[PDB]
């Protein structure tokens, strides 16, 4: 015997990563990182799916991967549109 000595897995944390998704807004929202009015017609900014944090497309890179904090009490609402053929 005396064989079989190894072990030590390691990897980044893909869970902490932000799930920001490029989406449009209907109201004048302000970034969460820098804090500046978010203008634009299509793909104005980005919004997470876990922390629903609105941030600029270029701000997402600056925002700290740190995602999943339970230190918030505010929660916005989502709207929907209709169509016809």
Q: Which is nearer to Zn ion, 40 or 82 (CB)?
A: 40
Q: Which is nearer to Zn ion, 2 or 72 (CB)?
A: 72
Binding site for Zn ion (CB under 5 A): 18, 31, 33-34, 48, 50-51, 56, 59, 67
Q: Least Å distance between CB 19 and Zn ion?
A: 6
8 Å CB contact between 55 and 81: no
Q: Least Å distance between CB 20 and Zn ion?
A: 7
Q: Which is nearer to Zn ion, 10 or 52 (CB)?
A: 52
d(CA 50, CA 37): 22
Report in angstroms the alpha-carbon separations of 70 from 9, 48, 51, 63, 74.
Answer: 29, 15, 9, 17, 11
Q: Least Å distance between CB 40 and Zn ion?
A: 12
Q: Residue 44: which of 22, 20, 21 has the closest Cα?
A: 22
């Amino acid at each position: 015997g005396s064989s079989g000595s190894s072990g030590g897995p390691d990897t980044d944390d893909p869970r902490s990563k932000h799930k920001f998704k490029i989406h449009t807004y209907g109201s004048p929202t302000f970034c969460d990182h820098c804090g500046s009015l978010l203008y634009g017609l299509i793909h104005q900014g980005m919004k997470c799916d876990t922390c629903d944090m609105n941030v600029h497309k270029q701000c997402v890179i600056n925002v700290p991967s740190l995602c999943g904090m339970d230190h918030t009490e505010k929660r916005g609402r989502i709207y929907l549109k209709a169509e016809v053929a």
